[PDB]
Amino acid sequence: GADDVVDSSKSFVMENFSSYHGTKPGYVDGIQKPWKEFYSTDNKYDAAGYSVDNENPLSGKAGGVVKVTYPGLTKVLALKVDNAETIKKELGLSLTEPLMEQVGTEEFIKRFGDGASRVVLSLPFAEGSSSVEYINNWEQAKALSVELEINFETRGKRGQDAMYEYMAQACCINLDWDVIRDKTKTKIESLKEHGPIKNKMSESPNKTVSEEKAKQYLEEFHQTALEHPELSELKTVTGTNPVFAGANYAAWAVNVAQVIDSETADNLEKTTAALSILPGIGSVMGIADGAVHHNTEEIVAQSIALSSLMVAQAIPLVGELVDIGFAAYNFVESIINLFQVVHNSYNRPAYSPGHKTQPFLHDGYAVSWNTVEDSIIRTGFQGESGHDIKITAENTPLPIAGVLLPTIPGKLDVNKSKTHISVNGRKIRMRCRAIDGDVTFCRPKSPVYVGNGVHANLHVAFHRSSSEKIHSNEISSDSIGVLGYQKTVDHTKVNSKLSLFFEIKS
């Protein structure tokens, strides 16, 4: 009955029920459908995650957050599961028409409304989160009044700075990114005017050389720069952890120079996509052993300045770019974004690192099925299923490029709206495309890193279009392929891959 699917401990009627909604750029200049449902949440800071430009999700401008209020009485109906078939079954609804259309009917409101004008559904927001998500009917949502909470397009704020500084209120790392940006330019100029740095630059081959020669030179560049008095703070931190050594630092800058071509360099979104899948970012960001070591505006600016100049030096040696301009422009802008992402994770409670089944370990990552049942993909019914996978990493921030998922035409499709990754409770949706008729690749809409203290739940959601059973000879994929960082070996690109094998059953 109702009781198997409604959580009565979280259900109630409120007058002037209010929640938060993240708005896309341009909106701030009521509520109207552009998603077959209007989503809101009790958490103004997580709302900020619905707000980035759908066309440039990693790097593009964030819009804002509004508070939306229904006048009169609203029933909040908390659900114990998010499976549409189960809900329709046990609430005794039509098993055919969409759940959210039915939720908007006179009859549903009378049956479940408890005297309210409308019903909103409530679900848990994500693994690792204590937030609530509300699901609203579009037509009903037209009654909402709307008040501005924050506009991230506010003049004077440069990147996604306004969004991340707002989100940092949740918390703690609370840096002024305007100060960092100003200080970064200042530090670059100081390094460029420094006699020893000028001397070191003139020692550059300044032409294509071996990766070994490049690294040797860049290591010396790193050491010379750390002796500048304006990098004294970064010098002190650098000596406290082997992650921050010149050799590791040099290795980041080489890898950057190797992957940035001119098409990439001239686009911030592409630059951010490329940088976000590289290993070894903890060496530059000062992150190791479960803590942010580069934790002031001074140290951050000093490391970004130095990495900028080191990328500039690396490009002639191992890169394919004619200009050095990338190093000062899109490189800095993109890396600032990555710092903000990782800080945001470290400002949140660590999702449990405890694998519930024996983990598979590879390349510093560990992955496991949440439960046996998660590893089973059932067949021979129409409808949805959800499957949880825990992802940790041992030490520095390691990226998750995305996930490779099986598909079978009309028997197993990825539900692109419910599939997501939650990093310390930050819920990040996915963009998914077919590699072919058998495999879909899903990439996070914000950069994902895991590391010590930053752990994730990957939630894969499938939809079945028909009631016929998947046949043994239809199974291309034995596994879900989680994709980690990309390494450039010879000149070829290899992704870290961690596979979890599943079983098809009736």
Numbering used by the authors: 1 to 29, 34 to 38, 50 to 186, 201 to 535
Article, verbatim:
Here, CRM197 was expressed as a soluble, intracellular protein in an Escherichia coli strain engineered to have an oxidative cytoplasm. The purified product, called EcoCRM, remained monomeric throughout crystallization. The structure of monomeric EcoCRM is reported at 2.0 Å resolution with the domain-swapping hinge loop (residues 379–387) in an extended, exposed conformation, similar to monomeric wild-type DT. Three internal zones are missing due to disorder. The first zone is residues 30–33, a surface loop near the active site, and the second is residues 39–49, which form the active-site loop that is only fully ordered in wild-type structures that include a substrate analog. The G52E mutation site is well ordered in the present structure. The third disordered zone comprises residues 187–200. Based on comparing the pH across known structures (including during protein preparation), it is likely that maintaining a high pH and avoiding phosphate were important in maintaining the monomeric state observed in the present report. The dimer conformation gains two positive-φ residues, Gly383 and Lys385, and is more compact; the Cα distance between Tyr380 and Pro388 decreases from 16.0 to 9.8 Å. In CRM197, the side chain of Lys385 in the hinge loop is more solvent-exposed in the monomeric structure (SASA of 91.6 Å2) than in the dimer (SASA of 2.4 Å2).
